[PDB]
Amino acid sequence: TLVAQISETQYPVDRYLDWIPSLRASAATAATFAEWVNTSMKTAFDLSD
Amino acid sequence: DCRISFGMNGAAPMIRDETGMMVPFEGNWIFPLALWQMNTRYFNQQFDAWIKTGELRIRIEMGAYPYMLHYYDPRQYANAWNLTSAWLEEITPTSIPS
Amino acid sequence: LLHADTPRLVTWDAGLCTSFKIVPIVPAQVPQDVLAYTFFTSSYAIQSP
Amino acid sequence: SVRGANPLMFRANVLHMLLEFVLDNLYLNRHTGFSQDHTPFTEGANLRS
């Protein structure tokens, strides 16, 4: 759901903020973003694996 | 597409409209921020003398921007050029200060 | 005839494929009387193609 | 003459030059890495290193 806001896909989730400007991100930018989305959840739920 | 021609022999310098007309440095304009962010040093040499004491209004379309606000005593003198020009000299091809 | 050499068929090129470069012949008159030195993009070290 | 050339050898030297020019450009174009444009110049292009 979060990568579909900054990238372009055909998966419909409802476009909850569009007035904030961004770029049509490619795979490297989306992977860097998804790594932070990963490590925030790992840091909060206290996982290591 | 904004190309700037200096006025020769006392003419006013001009800049290109999106339609195709050249216009002088007066009035009310509308920018995307990408124009300035392309030309952040060329436009400072051209426009900062006209914004400060002349008659030029520029509306820079952004959508979103973080802000830092200063307060002033309204019983005193207050001039915001040393903040405005400090912002305009620092917004750069990658980033933007608040 | 018992053992001959082998040719080098596969060879890779990583740079941009061209053979026609553009050479400057004379210099340009950037400090001049008529226009000020602020018109030229060479005064700001803007890289041009 | 160090700087002289026979005018009856011009076609032989031109075909000399063309054969060297064709034999030099026998390579294969190689894929290298890419990078997303963070500057606002292009509208999110994929530029190559």
Side-chain angles (χ1 to χ4, degrees):
Chain A
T1 306
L2 271 69
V3 76
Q5 298 290 322
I6 62 170
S7 66
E8 59 182 3
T9 57
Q10 296 296 109
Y11 179 71
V13 53
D14 294 329
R15 296 293 181 184
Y16 282 156
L17 56 90
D18 288 330
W19 59 270
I20 290 171
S22 176
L23 82 163
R24 280 84 55 87
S26 178
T29 302
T32 54
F33 179 75
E35 193 271 331
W36 290 97
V37 175
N38 191 5
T39 188
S40 179
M41 294 180 71
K42 288 189 286 185
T43 303
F45 288 161
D46 188 74
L47 276 78
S48 178
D49 289 331
Chain B
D1 191 2
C2 51
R3 295 191 296 273
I4 295 171
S5 67
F6 287 103
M8 295 298 293
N9 299 116
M14 292 180 183
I15 188 170
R16 188 180 176 181
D17 195 359
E18 68 181 0
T19 62
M21 188 178 175
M22 300 295 290
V23 291
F25 288 170
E26 292 178 354
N28 296 316
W29 293 352
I30 293 170
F31 288 176
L33 188 141
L35 290 176
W36 187 273
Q37 194 175 2
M38 288 177 185
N39 294 317
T40 185
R41 294 290 186 271
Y42 185 81
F43 289 169
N44 276 315
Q45 185 65 40
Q46 296 301 110
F47 295 110
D48 288 333
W50 293 97
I51 298 169
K52 184 178 184 294
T53 61
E55 292 84 4
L56 182 61
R57 301 290 182 90
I58 296 170
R59 177 176 174 176
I60 298 172
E61 291 180 352
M62 294 187 284
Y65 63 100
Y67 63 97
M68 178 179 72
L69 74 164
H70 297 89
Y71 293 1
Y72 66 97
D73 195 1
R75 68 180 67 251
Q76 295 298 110
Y77 182 76
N79 203 162
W81 182 256
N82 291 317
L83 281 75
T84 299
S85 177
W87 182 65
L88 292 174
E89 291 178 354
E90 288 179 355
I91 54 175
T92 193
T94 301
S95 67
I96 294 169
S98 299
Chain C
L1 194 146
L2 185 63
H3 186 273
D5 291 330
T6 181
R8 296 292 300 274
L9 292 176
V10 285
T11 52
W12 293 100
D13 191 2
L16 56 92
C17 56
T18 188
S19 297
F20 292 166
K21 69 183 290 185
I22 302 171
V23 58
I25 301 298
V26 306
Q29 50 180 359
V30 176
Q32 66 181 356
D33 194 5
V34 176
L35 292 175
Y37 64 96
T38 62
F39 177 77
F40 298 95
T41 62
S42 177
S43 297
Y44 295 157
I46 297 170
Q47 294 182 357
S48 67
Chain D
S1 299
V2 181
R3 64 180 65 87
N6 193 1
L8 297 175
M9 299 303 173
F10 284 167
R11 185 181 296 126
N13 289 314
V14 164
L15 273 304
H16 183 281
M17 185 176 179
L18 297 179
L19 188 68
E20 286 181 352
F21 182 78
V22 172
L23 265 296
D24 186 73
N25 290 318
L26 294 178
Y27 290 99
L28 280 75
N29 291 317
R30 180 65 180 271
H31 188 201
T32 58
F34 290 152
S35 66
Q36 177 62 261
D37 192 3
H38 292 178
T39 61
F41 290 166
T42 62
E43 293 179 354
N46 289 317
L47 302 171
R48 65 184 293 269
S49 67

PDB file of all heavy atoms in Angstrom, chain B residues 32-41 43 91-96, chain D residues 38-41:
ATOM      1  N   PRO B  32       6.573  27.406 -11.632  1.00  0.00           N
ATOM      2  CA  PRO B  32       6.893  26.192 -10.888  1.00  0.00           C
ATOM      3  C   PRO B  32       8.246  26.369 -10.226  1.00  0.00           C
ATOM      4  O   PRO B  32       9.077  27.158 -10.671  1.00  0.00           O
ATOM      5  CB  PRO B  32       6.944  25.109 -11.969  1.00  0.00           C
ATOM      6  CG  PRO B  32       6.147  25.659 -13.081  1.00  0.00           C
ATOM      7  CD  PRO B  32       6.407  27.129 -13.064  1.00  0.00           C
ATOM      8  N   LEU B  33       8.465  25.619  -9.146  1.00  0.00           N
ATOM      9  CA  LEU B  33       9.761  25.710  -8.487  1.00  0.00           C
ATOM     10  C   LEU B  33      10.870  25.083  -9.322  1.00  0.00           C
ATOM     11  O   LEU B  33      12.039  25.446  -9.140  1.00  0.00           O
ATOM     12  CB  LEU B  33       9.691  25.076  -7.092  1.00  0.00           C
ATOM     13  CG  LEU B  33      10.890  25.231  -6.147  1.00  0.00           C
ATOM     14  CD1 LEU B  33      10.432  25.460  -4.756  1.00  0.00           C
ATOM     15  CD2 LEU B  33      11.769  24.004  -6.161  1.00  0.00           C
ATOM     16  N   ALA B  34      10.524  24.191 -10.257  1.00  0.00           N
ATOM     17  CA  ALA B  34      11.533  23.541 -11.081  1.00  0.00           C
ATOM     18  C   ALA B  34      12.292  24.535 -11.951  1.00  0.00           C
ATOM     19  O   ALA B  34      13.468  24.312 -12.230  1.00  0.00           O
ATOM     20  CB  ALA B  34      10.896  22.456 -11.945  1.00  0.00           C
ATOM     21  N   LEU B  35      11.666  25.655 -12.328  1.00  0.00           N
ATOM     22  CA  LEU B  35      12.359  26.692 -13.094  1.00  0.00           C
ATOM     23  C   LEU B  35      13.508  27.301 -12.301  1.00  0.00           C
ATOM     24  O   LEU B  35      14.645  27.386 -12.790  1.00  0.00           O
ATOM     25  CB  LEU B  35      11.378  27.785 -13.503  1.00  0.00           C
ATOM     26  CG  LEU B  35      10.331  27.436 -14.544  1.00  0.00           C
ATOM     27  CD1 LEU B  35       9.423  28.618 -14.729  1.00  0.00           C
ATOM     28  CD2 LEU B  35      11.031  27.124 -15.820  1.00  0.00           C
ATOM     29  N   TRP B  36      13.227  27.719 -11.065  1.00  0.00           N
ATOM     30  CA  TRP B  36      14.279  28.254 -10.209  1.00  0.00           C
ATOM     31  C   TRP B  36      15.320  27.197  -9.887  1.00  0.00           C
ATOM     32  O   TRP B  36      16.520  27.490  -9.843  1.00  0.00           O
ATOM     33  CB  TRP B  36      13.699  28.780  -8.904  1.00  0.00           C
ATOM     34  CG  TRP B  36      14.706  29.477  -8.098  1.00  0.00           C
ATOM     35  CD1 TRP B  36      15.557  28.914  -7.204  1.00  0.00           C
ATOM     36  CD2 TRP B  36      14.957  30.886  -8.057  1.00  0.00           C
ATOM     37  NE1 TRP B  36      16.351  29.874  -6.628  1.00  0.00           N
ATOM     38  CE2 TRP B  36      16.000  31.093  -7.125  1.00  0.00           C
ATOM     39  CE3 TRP B  36      14.408  31.988  -8.713  1.00  0.00           C
ATOM     40  CZ2 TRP B  36      16.497  32.322  -6.837  1.00  0.00           C
ATOM     41  CZ3 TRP B  36      14.923  33.232  -8.425  1.00  0.00           C
ATOM     42  CH2 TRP B  36      15.950  33.385  -7.493  1.00  0.00           C
ATOM     43  N   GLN B  37      14.873  25.973  -9.625  1.00  0.00           N
ATOM     44  CA  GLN B  37      15.787  24.918  -9.230  1.00  0.00           C
ATOM     45  C   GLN B  37      16.691  24.500 -10.387  1.00  0.00           C
ATOM     46  O   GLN B  37      17.814  24.044 -10.150  1.00  0.00           O
ATOM     47  CB  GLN B  37      14.967  23.752  -8.677  1.00  0.00           C
ATOM     48  CG  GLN B  37      15.763  22.735  -7.930  1.00  0.00           C
ATOM     49  CD  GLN B  37      14.919  21.663  -7.292  1.00  0.00           C
ATOM     50  OE1 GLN B  37      13.702  21.652  -7.425  1.00  0.00           O
ATOM     51  NE2 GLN B  37      15.570  20.744  -6.592  1.00  0.00           N
ATOM     52  N   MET B  38      16.235  24.674 -11.631  1.00  0.00           N
ATOM     53  CA  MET B  38      17.135  24.616 -12.776  1.00  0.00           C
ATOM     54  C   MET B  38      18.125  25.762 -12.743  1.00  0.00           C
ATOM     55  O   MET B  38      19.338  25.555 -12.849  1.00  0.00           O
ATOM     56  CB  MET B  38      16.352  24.659 -14.089  1.00  0.00           C
ATOM     57  CG  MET B  38      15.599  23.407 -14.413  1.00  0.00           C
ATOM     58  SD  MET B  38      14.606  23.485 -15.897  1.00  0.00           S
ATOM     59  CE  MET B  38      13.826  21.885 -15.768  1.00  0.00           C
ATOM     60  N   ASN B  39      17.627  26.986 -12.601  1.00  0.00           N
ATOM     61  CA  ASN B  39      18.483  28.167 -12.673  1.00  0.00           C
ATOM     62  C   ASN B  39      18.427  28.910 -11.346  1.00  0.00           C
ATOM     63  O   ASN B  39      17.710  29.899 -11.198  1.00  0.00           O
ATOM     64  CB  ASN B  39      18.045  29.016 -13.787  1.00  0.00           C
ATOM     65  CG  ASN B  39      18.245  28.351 -15.118  1.00  0.00           C
ATOM     66  OD1 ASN B  39      19.276  27.730 -15.364  1.00  0.00           O
ATOM     67  ND2 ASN B  39      17.250  28.459 -15.986  1.00  0.00           N
ATOM     68  N   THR B  40      19.216  28.442 -10.385  1.00  0.00           N
ATOM     69  CA  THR B  40      19.272  29.039  -9.060  1.00  0.00           C
ATOM     70  C   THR B  40      20.357  30.089  -8.911  1.00  0.00           C
ATOM     71  O   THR B  40      20.311  30.863  -7.952  1.00  0.00           O
ATOM     72  CB  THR B  40      19.476  27.953  -8.001  1.00  0.00           C
ATOM     73  OG1 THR B  40      19.409  28.538  -6.697  1.00  0.00           O
ATOM     74  CG2 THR B  40      20.820  27.293  -8.178  1.00  0.00           C
ATOM     75  N   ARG B  41      21.338  30.131  -9.810  1.00  0.00           N
ATOM     76  CA  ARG B  41      22.363  31.160  -9.766  1.00  0.00           C
ATOM     77  C   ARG B  41      22.233  32.178 -10.874  1.00  0.00           C
ATOM     78  O   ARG B  41      22.656  33.318 -10.695  1.00  0.00           O
ATOM     79  CB  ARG B  41      23.765  30.546  -9.840  1.00  0.00           C
ATOM     80  CG  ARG B  41      24.144  29.700  -8.656  1.00  0.00           C
ATOM     81  CD  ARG B  41      24.357  30.510  -7.404  1.00  0.00           C
ATOM     82  NE  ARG B  41      24.849  29.663  -6.325  1.00  0.00           N
ATOM     83  CZ  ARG B  41      24.066  29.008  -5.476  1.00  0.00           C
ATOM     84  NH1 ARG B  41      22.749  29.105  -5.579  1.00  0.00           N
ATOM     85  NH2 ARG B  41      24.596  28.257  -4.525  1.00  0.00           N
ATOM     86  N   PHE B  43      19.304  33.205 -12.096  1.00  0.00           N
ATOM     87  CA  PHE B  43      18.148  34.051 -11.821  1.00  0.00           C
ATOM     88  C   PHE B  43      18.380  34.971 -10.632  1.00  0.00           C
ATOM     89  O   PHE B  43      17.722  36.009 -10.521  1.00  0.00           O
ATOM     90  CB  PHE B  43      16.898  33.200 -11.586  1.00  0.00           C
ATOM     91  CG  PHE B  43      16.363  32.515 -12.823  1.00  0.00           C
ATOM     92  CD1 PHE B  43      15.385  31.541 -12.709  1.00  0.00           C
ATOM     93  CD2 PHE B  43      16.815  32.850 -14.088  1.00  0.00           C
ATOM     94  CE1 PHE B  43      14.887  30.907 -13.821  1.00  0.00           C
ATOM     95  CE2 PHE B  43      16.318  32.212 -15.203  1.00  0.00           C
ATOM     96  CZ  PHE B  43      15.351  31.245 -15.066  1.00  0.00           C
ATOM     97  N   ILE B  91      18.304  27.833  -2.031  1.00  0.00           N
ATOM     98  CA  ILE B  91      17.564  26.760  -2.688  1.00  0.00           C
ATOM     99  C   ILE B  91      18.289  26.367  -3.969  1.00  0.00           C
ATOM    100  O   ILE B  91      18.623  27.212  -4.804  1.00  0.00           O
ATOM    101  CB  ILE B  91      16.090  27.137  -2.915  1.00  0.00           C
ATOM    102  CG1 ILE B  91      15.884  28.438  -3.658  1.00  0.00           C
ATOM    103  CG2 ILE B  91      15.386  27.285  -1.605  1.00  0.00           C
ATOM    104  CD1 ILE B  91      14.414  28.687  -3.965  1.00  0.00           C
ATOM    105  N   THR B  92      18.575  25.081  -4.092  1.00  0.00           N
ATOM    106  CA  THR B  92      19.657  24.529  -4.888  1.00  0.00           C
ATOM    107  C   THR B  92      19.082  23.404  -5.735  1.00  0.00           C
ATOM    108  O   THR B  92      17.972  22.939  -5.460  1.00  0.00           O
ATOM    109  CB  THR B  92      20.755  24.046  -3.917  1.00  0.00           C
ATOM    110  OG1 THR B  92      21.975  23.755  -4.601  1.00  0.00           O
ATOM    111  CG2 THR B  92      20.315  22.833  -3.147  1.00  0.00           C
ATOM    112  N   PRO B  93      19.784  22.973  -6.831  1.00  0.00           N
ATOM    113  CA  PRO B  93      19.264  21.877  -7.675  1.00  0.00           C
ATOM    114  C   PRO B  93      18.894  20.550  -7.027  1.00  0.00           C
ATOM    115  O   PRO B  93      18.270  19.713  -7.684  1.00  0.00           O
ATOM    116  CB  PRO B  93      20.398  21.660  -8.678  1.00  0.00           C
ATOM    117  CG  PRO B  93      20.939  22.981  -8.872  1.00  0.00           C
ATOM    118  CD  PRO B  93      20.860  23.685  -7.545  1.00  0.00           C
ATOM    119  N   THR B  94      19.245  20.326  -5.769  1.00  0.00           N
ATOM    120  CA  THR B  94      18.818  19.122  -5.079  1.00  0.00           C
ATOM    121  C   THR B  94      17.825  19.390  -3.962  1.00  0.00           C
ATOM    122  O   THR B  94      16.819  18.691  -3.862  1.00  0.00           O
ATOM    123  CB  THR B  94      20.035  18.383  -4.516  1.00  0.00           C
ATOM    124  OG1 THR B  94      20.917  18.045  -5.590  1.00  0.00           O
ATOM    125  CG2 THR B  94      19.622  17.096  -3.821  1.00  0.00           C
ATOM    126  N   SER B  95      18.042  20.407  -3.142  1.00  0.00           N
ATOM    127  CA  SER B  95      17.293  20.538  -1.905  1.00  0.00           C
ATOM    128  C   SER B  95      16.767  21.955  -1.732  1.00  0.00           C
ATOM    129  O   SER B  95      17.017  22.843  -2.548  1.00  0.00           O
ATOM    130  CB  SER B  95      18.161  20.153  -0.713  1.00  0.00           C
ATOM    131  OG  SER B  95      19.201  21.093  -0.543  1.00  0.00           O
ATOM    132  N   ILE B  96      16.017  22.149  -0.648  1.00  0.00           N
ATOM    133  CA  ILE B  96      15.332  23.399  -0.314  1.00  0.00           C
ATOM    134  C   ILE B  96      15.383  23.615   1.194  1.00  0.00           C
ATOM    135  O   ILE B  96      14.957  22.730   1.946  1.00  0.00           O
ATOM    136  CB  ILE B  96      13.863  23.378  -0.763  1.00  0.00           C
ATOM    137  CG1 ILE B  96      13.704  23.337  -2.267  1.00  0.00           C
ATOM    138  CG2 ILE B  96      13.139  24.596  -0.289  1.00  0.00           C
ATOM    139  CD1 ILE B  96      12.303  23.060  -2.638  1.00  0.00           C
TER     140      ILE B  96
ATOM    141  N   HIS D  38      17.670  12.487  -9.602  1.00  0.00           N
ATOM    142  CA  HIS D  38      17.074  13.193  -8.476  1.00  0.00           C
ATOM    143  C   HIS D  38      16.884  14.678  -8.746  1.00  0.00           C
ATOM    144  O   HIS D  38      16.040  15.306  -8.100  1.00  0.00           O
ATOM    145  CB  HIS D  38      17.916  13.021  -7.210  1.00  0.00           C
ATOM    146  CG  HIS D  38      17.923  11.627  -6.664  1.00  0.00           C
ATOM    147  ND1 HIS D  38      18.654  11.271  -5.552  1.00  0.00           N
ATOM    148  CD2 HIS D  38      17.316  10.496  -7.093  1.00  0.00           C
ATOM    149  CE1 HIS D  38      18.479   9.986  -5.306  1.00  0.00           C
ATOM    150  NE2 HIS D  38      17.675   9.492  -6.228  1.00  0.00           N
ATOM    151  N   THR D  39      17.648  15.248  -9.670  1.00  0.00           N
ATOM    152  CA  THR D  39      17.478  16.631 -10.073  1.00  0.00           C
ATOM    153  C   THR D  39      16.196  16.779 -10.888  1.00  0.00           C
ATOM    154  O   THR D  39      15.733  15.817 -11.499  1.00  0.00           O
ATOM    155  CB  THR D  39      18.687  17.069 -10.893  1.00  0.00           C
ATOM    156  OG1 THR D  39      18.786  16.251 -12.064  1.00  0.00           O
ATOM    157  CG2 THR D  39      19.948  16.922 -10.075  1.00  0.00           C
ATOM    158  N   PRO D  40      15.590  17.978 -10.920  1.00  0.00           N
ATOM    159  CA  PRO D  40      14.304  18.106 -11.617  1.00  0.00           C
ATOM    160  C   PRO D  40      14.418  18.399 -13.102  1.00  0.00           C
ATOM    161  O   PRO D  40      13.448  18.870 -13.703  1.00  0.00           O
ATOM    162  CB  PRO D  40      13.641  19.280 -10.896  1.00  0.00           C
ATOM    163  CG  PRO D  40      14.765  20.119 -10.505  1.00  0.00           C
ATOM    164  CD  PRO D  40      15.883  19.187 -10.134  1.00  0.00           C
ATOM    165  N   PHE D  41      15.589  18.156 -13.696  1.00  0.00           N
ATOM    166  CA  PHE D  41      15.804  18.497 -15.101  1.00  0.00           C
ATOM    167  C   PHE D  41      14.969  17.614 -16.009  1.00  0.00           C
ATOM    168  O   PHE D  41      14.075  18.090 -16.717  1.00  0.00           O
ATOM    169  CB  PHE D  41      17.278  18.353 -15.459  1.00  0.00           C
ATOM    170  CG  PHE D  41      18.164  19.383 -14.841  1.00  0.00           C
ATOM    171  CD1 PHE D  41      19.525  19.206 -14.836  1.00  0.00           C
ATOM    172  CD2 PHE D  41      17.647  20.530 -14.281  1.00  0.00           C
ATOM    173  CE1 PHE D  41      20.341  20.143 -14.280  1.00  0.00           C
ATOM    174  CE2 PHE D  41      18.475  21.464 -13.719  1.00  0.00           C
ATOM    175  CZ  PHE D  41      19.818  21.274 -13.721  1.00  0.00           C
TER     176      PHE D  41
END
